[PDB]
Amino acid sequence: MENFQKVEKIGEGTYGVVYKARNKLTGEVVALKKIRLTEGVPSTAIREISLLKELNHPNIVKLLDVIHTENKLYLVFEFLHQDLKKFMDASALTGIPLPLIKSYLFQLLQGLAFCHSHRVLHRDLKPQNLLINTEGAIKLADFGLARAFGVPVRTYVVTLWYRAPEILLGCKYYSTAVDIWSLGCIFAEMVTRRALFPGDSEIDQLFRIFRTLGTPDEVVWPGVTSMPDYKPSFPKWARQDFSKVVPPLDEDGRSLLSQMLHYDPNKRISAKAALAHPFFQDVTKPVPHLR
Amino acid sequence: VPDYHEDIHTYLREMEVKCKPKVGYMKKQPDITNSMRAILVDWLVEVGEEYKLQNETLHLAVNYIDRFLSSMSVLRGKLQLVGTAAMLLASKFEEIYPPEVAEFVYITDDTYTKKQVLRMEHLVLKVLTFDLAAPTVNQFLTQYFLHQQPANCKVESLAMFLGELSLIDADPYLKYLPSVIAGAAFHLALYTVTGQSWPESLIRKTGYTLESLKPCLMDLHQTYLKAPQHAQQSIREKYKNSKYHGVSLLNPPETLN
Numbered sequence: 062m063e064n065f066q067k068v069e070k071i072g073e074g075t076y077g078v079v080y081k082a083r084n085k086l087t088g089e090v091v092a093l094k095k096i097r098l099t100e101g102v103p104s105t106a107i108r109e110i111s112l113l114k115e116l117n118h119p120n121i122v123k124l125l126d127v128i129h130t131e132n133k134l135y136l137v138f139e140f141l142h143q144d145l146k147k148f149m150d151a152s153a154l155t156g157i158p159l160p161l162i163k164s165y166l167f168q169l170l171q172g173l174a175f176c177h178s179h180r181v182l183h184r185d186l187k188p189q190n191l192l193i194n195t196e197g198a199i200k201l202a203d204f205g206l207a208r209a210f211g212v213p214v215r216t217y218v219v220t221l222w223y224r225a226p227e228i229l230l231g232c233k234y235y236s237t238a239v240d241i242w243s244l245g246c247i248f249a250e251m252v253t254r255r256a257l258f259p260g261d262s263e264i265d266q267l268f269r270i271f272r273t274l275g276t277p278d279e280v281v282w283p284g285v286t287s288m289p290d291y292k293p294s295f296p297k298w299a300r301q302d303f304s305k306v307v308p309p310l311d312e313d314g315r316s317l318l319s320q321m322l323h324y325d326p327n328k329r330i331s332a333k334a335a336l337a338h339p340f341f342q343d344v345t346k347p348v349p350h351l352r
Numbered sequence: 353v354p355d356y357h358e359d360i361h362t363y364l365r366e367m368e369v370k371c372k373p374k375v376g377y378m379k380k381q382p383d384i385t386n387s388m389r390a391i392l393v394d395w396l397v398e399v400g401e402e403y404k405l406q407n408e409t410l411h412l413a414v415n416y417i418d419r420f421l422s423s424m425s426v427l428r429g430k431l432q433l434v435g436t437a438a439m440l441l442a443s444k445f446e447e448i449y450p451p452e453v454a455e456f457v458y459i460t461d462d463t464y465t466k467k468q469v470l471r472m473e474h475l476v477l478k479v480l481t482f483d484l485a486a487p488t489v490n491q492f493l494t495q496y497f498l499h500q501q502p503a504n505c506k507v508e509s510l511a512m513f514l515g516e517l518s519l520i521d522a523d524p525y526l527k528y529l530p531s532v533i534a535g536a537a538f539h540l541a542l543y544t545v546t547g548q549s550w551p552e553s554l555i556r557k558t559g560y561t562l563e564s565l566k567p568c569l570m571d572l573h574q575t576y577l578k579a580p581q582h583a584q585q586s587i588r589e590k591y592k593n594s595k596y597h598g599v600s601l602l603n604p605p606e607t608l609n
């Protein structure tokens with residue numbers, strides 16, 4: 062711990078504080094996550110550490126070290142230049158170019174396919190948890206809510222806007238599909254510059270999803286009318302033409318997005334399968350313009 | 353979703369080798385024995401029931417204990433402290449929300465203090481180098497259960513029952529990887545309930561033939577047959593519940609052919 066120089070605060074929350082820091086001996090720039098620390102090591106830190114240690118992939122943020130004193134606990138991460146949320150705002154006037162959207166989605170799916178095939182669910186995929194550098198990389202971050210699904214993970218979380226319909230309807234278990242739902246929402250947000258389903262509440266969130274994608278029935282999604290939080294009195298909305306939901310997308314993007322937003326979590330495309338979608342046939346690695 | 357099952361299985365098969373304890377560790381522990389370990393694990397089972405924790409939690413805790421005892425000498429009076437800390441860690445990893453520390457001190461019957469449990473937690477984490485996501489028999493059974501034709505809750509509960517029994521006896525079960533014990537537990541449960549055998553699809557998926565499972569199957573059959581006469585009874589009592597279809601009351605077959 063004496064080898065690190067604090068440069069500046071980069072975040073704060075219930076966990077503790079996050080600092081940009083420098084290694085005094087090697088010069089390495091790092092993100093220091095400091096956990097306050099009589100309840101012991103927090104459950105989220107136990108999970109975040111043991112899961113990330115297993116996950117070495119170029120599109121997942123590296124845990125560089127864990128320093129465990131008697132009364133403080135530090136998580137040392139590689140440092141990236143900003144989050145997608147901050148990038149999307151900077152891009153509000155100009156837009157993010159479509160080849161860069163494609164590159165980002167492609168890399169996000171690679172990181173996620175890696176997580177999923179290593180039995181880790183992320184569960185909290187949102188623009189501010191995705192980190193970018195100036196050389197065109199995007200990486201999943203904040204595995205504070207991540208879970209190993211060697212056995213199925215029961216439902217308790219994730220911010221509302223990116224929450225899958227099956228969770229809102231009160232399914233018993235999570236599945237990999239919840240993460241794909243989140244990426245699909247983020248994909249559309251990059252394209253339109255607007256949150257796809259920005260709800261005030263759980264019920265407003267469902268209703269926004271329904272108004273766009275159609276109110277699901279037993280044909281579309283078997284078992285749906287039997288789910289704990291389904292109501293017969295739900296309004297029955299028509300599905301909307303995707304050319305009106307994400308106008309600047311070609312046929313291939315609309316295809317992928319609708320498969321990512323598929324109602325039935327059993328038939329919602331996987332990250333693995335999404336990587337082979339004709340949408341990524343001409344994927345390149347463009348460099349973003351960061352402020 | 354079907355896509356990831358193979359990659360996950362392959363990964364767990366890889367991870368179970370890295371997360372295995374040393375097989376002859378108990379011989380190198382001057383003050384503790386297999387018998388004491390059996391008492392401890394049986395107690396943890398009770399703890400699991402009393403606090404309504406998942407079976408996965410129990411399995412993970414045992415893995416942590418066995419790994420910890422693979423590199424640290426422990427005196428008999430401190431074994432339960434290692435046990436409690438492992439259970440607490442397992443809870444923190446696996447449970448939606450774990451019981452608070454005070455509840456874990458309560459079950460020791462005031463033997464150790466809060467401070468002691470938390471320091472042991474720190475120590476176990478240090479010794480295990482934070483590697484807590486260990487593959488378990490439970491995980492493999494879960495994977496294997498998808499190859500049932502069709503699914504049978506009696507089979508599942510009995511497989512779970514036999515797998516849990518394997519946790520009690522370090523001799524012989526430390527000799528076997530979780531994927532192997534699960535292989536045996538699955539076939540034995542399948543054979544007892546339905547008369548079917550370790551299915552072709554699992555042979556292809558796991559690479560294990562029925563023949564290759566034989567040594568472990570012979571041990572597990574013996575455990576199963578002798579279960580009512582074992583000193584440790586918590587698991588049998590657990591599996592009398594209708595929750596698990598009272599499978600621990602099912603008569604085991606006399607031979608395996």
Ligand SMILES: COc1cc2ncn(-c3cc(O[C@H](C)c4ccccc4Cl)c(C(N)=O)s3)c2cc1OC
Binds near residue numbers: 092201204
């Ligand atoms: C430039 O702004 C950055 C850079 C950066 N490089 C690494 N990180 C990480 C922080 C972190 O933990 C905290 C809890 C976190 C995660 C996601 C979003 C915000 C915050 Cl504060 C990482 C992790 N847990 O994987 S990686 C950052 C953060 C950052 O601005 C927040």
